[PDB]
């Protein structure tokens, strides 16, 4: 028939050439996809048996007519998707029956107007999407006042050319309504004078709207008197773009009040379009996919609380001294910038990942000029040379270096100051652990991710003595061959311990006797022959002991271990699948008779 993902709950019926609904699917199903089937016409009582549906997908289903009361037993449905159906005209009470509907997706349905759109019935409606249609007007229909729960309306990819005073009349008589408007991909050249006066919006998206700089500047002026929380601006690569892009095209904006401002891709860009005076009173500033090359002479009187730089093109690390900036993201930069010392006395969050960043002299107060930093992400970067053990940054809770090249970290107690750190990731940093005091000072740490590294003489050393609060320890892929006596004796709170993908030839249970909280022990993909020690030293809290893909020696020499496997088969994972590798199938099937 179809495909069954979750029994009695979720089914996939795509590209199955169905005429109508397969009406033998459980009468208690939650979610169903029927997209890409030539349904053609949607008869009445066709959906009737499924009283507990929530998600219906009828995308590109050749549908031209919705019969009156096509939805009969759907007073529980919340998501309805009708993308790419030549319905065109929606009759009175087309959606009669959906009283619990939250999201209505009417993209590419040949829909001409929101006036004729028979939705003034659906009280519970939150989101409405009418992108890719034949909508000419921008009028917010009067019935929207019955739509008490509506917050997002998508008007992308349409034919709206004017935003007039009359269009936004609904909003003007209703300043209490939290509403967002995606207005992207409309060819707008005229916005009426005083059209945006005394209106409030949550987020306004104006991407790829304007054909020339003159039209853009003119229109933004006539946005006067708008309060928006979030204004998304810019254009697309796969669209014909504004040739000349000066900062003065932004001029209209400082007659509107903006909380957060998001500029996206622009064909032309001037580095000093970000240090523009109309953006001074903004609390969050964002750049994404932007040709910015330098970010430097930003005025000190700017109110920016967060600054986000994603997939831009900086040739240099920015000079910044904004005294009120709490949060900074500079990530996925196109080139390979090196860190330049910065002064941000309010910073508590700093993501500088995925930049191939050089950082020589990491890290201490003088690098940042903050006392408040809790989150430091320097993952997926170049060479980071440790020379200072975070003096001045003891507020840190989250430190992430995964996949960066950490240098000199074994040279000294590089993390000594981080008394309050909860999370440390030094996985795939190529650190050869060489020093027993590497983790000294990490007394609060819960999570220690250090996969991919290695240890002197391939022996796991007493590096954990004082990391008492560890609940999670990943030591996978560290080429481990031997574990030192006492290494875990202090880890009383530890729950998961990953040592998969090493070269251990055996386990010794005594290594784990103090591990009273250990629910997960992953020892798979080693070369484990047996377990020495008193087998009763394995934690009674153990729920998932993974010993798959090892190489067990089914000799009488190890008769007790082999029994113990039968004994504990409830707690070992993929037990029956395990197979011997000595004298070649299987394992739970070892006997007990060759001298033993």
């Amino acid at each position: 028939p179809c495909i069954e993902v979750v029994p009695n709950i979720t089914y996939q019926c795509m590209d199955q050439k169905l005429s109508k609904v397969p009406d033998d699917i459980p009468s208690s199903t939650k979610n169903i996809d029927l997209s890409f089937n030539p349904l053609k016409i949607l008869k009445s009582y066709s959906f009737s048996n499924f009283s507990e549906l929530q998600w219906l997908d009828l995308s590109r289903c050749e549908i031209e007519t919705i019969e009156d009361k096509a939805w009969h037993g759907l007073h529980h449905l919340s998501n309805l998707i009708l993308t790419g159906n030549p319905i065109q005209s929606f009759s009175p009470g087309s959606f009669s029956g959906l009283t619990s509907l939250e999201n209505l997706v009417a993209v590419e349905t040949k829909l001409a107007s929101l006036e004729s759109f028979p939705i003034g019935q659906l009280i519970t409606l939150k989101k409405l999407n009418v992108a890719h249609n034949f909508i000419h007007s921008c009028k917010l229909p009067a019935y929207f006042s019955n739509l008490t729960n509506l917050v997002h309306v998508d008007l992308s990819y349409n034919y709206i050319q004017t935003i007039t005073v009359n269009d936004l009349q609904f909003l003007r008589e209703n300043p209490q309504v939290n509403l967002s408007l995606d207005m992207s991909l409309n060819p707008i050249d005229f916005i009426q004078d005083q059209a945006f006066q005394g209106i409030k919006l949550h987020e306004l998206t104006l991407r790829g709207n304007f054909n020339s700089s003159n039209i853009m500047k003119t229109c933004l002026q006539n946005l006067a008197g708008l309060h928006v929380h979030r204004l998304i601006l810019g254009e697309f690569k796969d669209e014909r773009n504004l040739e000349i892009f000066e900062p003065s095209i932004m001029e209209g904006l400082c007659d509107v009040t903006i909380d957060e401002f998001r500029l996206t891709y622009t064909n032309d860009f001037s580095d000093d379009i970000v240090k523009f005076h109309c953006l001074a009173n903004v609390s969050a500033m964002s750049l994404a996919g932007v040709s910015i090359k330098y970010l430097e002479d930003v005025p000190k009187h700017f109110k920016w609380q967060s600054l986000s730089i994603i997939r831009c093109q900086l040739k240099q690390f920015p000079t910044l001294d904004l005294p009120f900036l709490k949060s900074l993201t500079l990530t996925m930069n196109k080139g390979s910038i090196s860190f330049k010392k910065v002064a941000l006395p309010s910073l508590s969050y700093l993501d500088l990942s995925r930049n191939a960043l050089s950082f020589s002299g990491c890290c201490s107060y003088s690098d940042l000029g903050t006392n408040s930093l809790r989150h430091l992400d320097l993952s997926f970067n170049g060479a980071i040379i440790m020379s200072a053990n975070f003096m001045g940054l003891e507020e840190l809770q989250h430190l992430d270096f995964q996949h960066s090249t950490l240098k000199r970290v074994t040279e000294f107690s590089a993390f000594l100051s981080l008394e309050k750190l909860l999370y440390l990731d030094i996985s795939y940093t190529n650190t050869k652990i060489d020093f027993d005091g590497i983790f000294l000072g990490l007394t609060s740490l819960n999570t220690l991710k250090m996969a991919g590294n290695s240890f002197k003489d391939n022996t796991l050393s007493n590096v954990f003595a004082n990391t008492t609060n560890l609940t999670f320890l990943d030591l996978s892929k560290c080429q481990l061959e031997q574990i030192s006596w006492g290494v875990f004796d202090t880890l009383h709170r530890l729950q998961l311990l990953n040592m998969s993908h090493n070269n251990l030839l055996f386990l010794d249970s005594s290594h784990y006797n103090q591990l009273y909280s250990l629910s997960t022990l992953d020892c798979s993909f080693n070369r484990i022959e047996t377990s020495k020690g008193i087998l009763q030293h394995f934690p009674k809290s153990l729920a998932f002991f993974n010993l798959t893909n090892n190489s067990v020696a089914c000799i009488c020499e190890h008769q007790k271990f082999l029994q113990w496997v039968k004994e504990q088969k409830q707690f070992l994972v993929n037990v029956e699948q395990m197979t011997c590798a000595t004298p070649n199938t299987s394992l739970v099937l070892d006997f007990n008779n060759s001298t033993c």
């Binding site: 997908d57 590109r60 993308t83 992308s156 690569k237 796969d238 669209e239 996206t264 996919g289």
Partner: protein, 135 residues
């Protein structure tokens, strides 16, 4: 099978994958020179999933010697560079994507590229193309 062109240093063709045959019309004007090309990739199809998190797996081989899997992301899902990242499942996409590249030294011979398009949210194959490049 589906499309062919030849530039001054390459012949380029594609067919659908043996495992998957969902329709896409992809084309490049002009035909890709491996030395360097400025032009557009024209794409016209009806996506079988949402394109909010579109990424490609590129499986490339040169004369049977195979390069490691290559992941390329086009839509990260937040303020994306292309108009088609907002395009939904079962929506008509018609777009031309401009591009350029400077050109490196490539060994002469036979290139196989299988390019899987993934919807990173669902993690399901959107389409699959089997490119041939003779250089």
């Amino acid at each position: 099978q589906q499309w062919f062109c030849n530039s001054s240093d390459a012949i380029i063709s594609y067919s659908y994958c043996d495992h998957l045959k969902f329709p896409i019309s992809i084309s490049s004007e002009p035909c890709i020179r491996l030395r360097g090309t400025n032009g557009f990739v024209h794409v016209e199809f009806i996506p079988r999933g949402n394109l909010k998190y579109l990424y490609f797996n590129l499986f490339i081989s040169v004369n049977s010697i195979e390069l490691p899997k290559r992941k390329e992301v086009l839509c990260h899902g937040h303020d994306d560079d292309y108009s088609f990242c907002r395009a939904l499942k079962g929506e008509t996409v018609n777009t031309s994507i401009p591009f350029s590249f400077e050109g490196i030294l490539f060994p002469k011979g036979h290139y196989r590229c299988v390019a899987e398009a993934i919807a990173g949210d669902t993690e399901e194959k959107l389409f699959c193309l089997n490119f041939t490049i003779i250089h």
